[PDB]
Design a protein around this ligand. Structure first.
Ligand SMILES: *C/C=C(C)/C=C/C=C(C)/C=C/C1=C(C)CCCC1(C)C
Ligand SMILES: CCCCCCCCCCCCCCCC
Ligand SMILES: CCCCCCCCCCCCCCCC
Ligand SMILES: CCCCCCCCCC
Ligand SMILES: CCCCCCCCC
Ligand SMILES: CCCCCCCCC
Ligand SMILES: CCCCCCCCC
Ligand SMILES: CCCCCCCCC
Ligand SMILES: CCCCCCCCC
Ligand SMILES: [Ca+2]
Ligand SMILES: [Cl-]
Ligand SMILES: [Cl-]
Ligand SMILES: [Cl-]
Ligand code: NA
Length: 240
């Protein structure tokens, strides 16, 4: 695969996992240090949620770097690598990101339950797809997971956006900037999966790991940077 076998264990993709580790740790430490001077009760909740997003990803990237949680899946005459930590990362961090958006929009706990329940189903079915042993199952679960993603994004774009609007310009501008980011970045994930090693196999694991790493850093550290610099996080929140 495209990269460089840093640890001398036959995995050129560790180059990208190492860089990803470093960027996630630096982002975590930046937000943490910026958080220590924050007193407002709402801002503290946003910081707490948001620090954990690159924080948990840091742990997942480090695990992947060292080869912890790596195994192979047999698909006919081919053995696909799967890093379990990647899915565990997304299972925890995607609800956290949605929770940030739901706090901005100030929506009810039933709406949040729906959003995060569909998000969890998306990640689980993606994992089932990655572990499946025939191409028909892989594409099927991928499609299922993708329809779940559209439902999440549809809710962000319609119901949560409408709610944020009622909260005035500071909140609605921040909500709309972040939602613009999410709609684009999150859609990139199923596209990479299907053209990469898990699907059609056009790109190999090296390029795939690199691109997931860029997406992950943008979706976590980039998102965090946009949110935490906004005056909107000082406004009232109601936790679920
Ligand atoms: C911290 C990283 C973020 C924001 C991760 C997002 C991940 C996804 C939107 C993943 C989506 C997938 C599908 C919709 C289908 C194939 C399986 C996944 C999990 C790659
Ligand atoms: C012989 C060693 C080869 C090393 C190749 C280094 C190329 C530069 C890597 C930069 C990766 C993109 C970072 C993306 C930032 C989010
Ligand atoms: C205003 C000072 C900025 C310092 C931020 C430090 C964080 C370093 C992590 C780099 C990751 C870049 C992600 C951005 C992608 C759009
Ligand atoms: C909502 C759909 C947005 C599509 C963005 C495409 C990104 C190209 C990889
Ligand atoms: C443990 C962190 C991994 C450092 C690797 C740096 C790659 C250039
Ligand atoms: C042989 C050592 C190569 C190390 C690659 C680091 C790339 C810079 C981020
Ligand atoms: C003080 C909080 C550190 C950042 C969260 C790390 C999470 C460990 C898995
Ligand atoms: C949660 C990060 C994992 C660190 C374990 C390192 C062990 C080296 C083989
Ligand atoms: C596939 C993304 C769902 C959003 C559709 C509505 C467009 C509003 C920006
Ligand atoms: Ca406040
Ligand atoms: Cl403050
Ligand atoms: Cl306060
Ligand atoms: Cl490759
Ligand atoms: Na290596």
């Amino acid at each position: 695969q495209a990269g460089y076998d840093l640890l001398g264990d036959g995995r050129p993709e560790t180059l990208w996992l190492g860089i990803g580790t470093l960027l996630m740790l630096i982002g975590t430490f930046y937000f943490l240090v910026r958080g220590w001077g924050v007193t407002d009760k709402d801002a503290r909740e946003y910081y707490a949620v948001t620090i954990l997003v690159p924080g948990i990803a840091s742990a997942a990237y480090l695990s992947m770097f060292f080869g912890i949680g790596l195994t192979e899946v047999t698909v006919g005459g081919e053995m696909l690598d799967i890093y379990y930590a990647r899915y565990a990362d997304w299972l925890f961090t995607t609800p956290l990101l949605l929770l940030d958006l739901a706090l901005l929009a100030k929506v009810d706990r039933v709406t949040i339950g729906t959003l995060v329940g569909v998000d969890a189903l998306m990640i689980v079915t993606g994992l089932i797809g990655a572990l499946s042993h025939t191409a028909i199952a892989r594409y099927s679960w991928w499609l299922f997971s993708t329809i779940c993603m559209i439902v999440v994004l549809y809710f962000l774009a319609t119901s949560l956006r409408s709610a944020a609007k009622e909260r005035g310009p500071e909140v609605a501008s921040t909500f709309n900037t972040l939602t613009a980011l999410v709609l684009v970045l999150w859609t990139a994930y199923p596209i990479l999966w299907i053209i990469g090693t898990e699907g059609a196999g056009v790109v190999g694991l090296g390029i795939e790991t690199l691109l997931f790493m860029v997406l992950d850093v943008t979706a976590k550290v980039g998102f965090g940077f946009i949110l935490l610099r906004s005056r909107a996080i000082l406004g009232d929140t109601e936790a679920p």
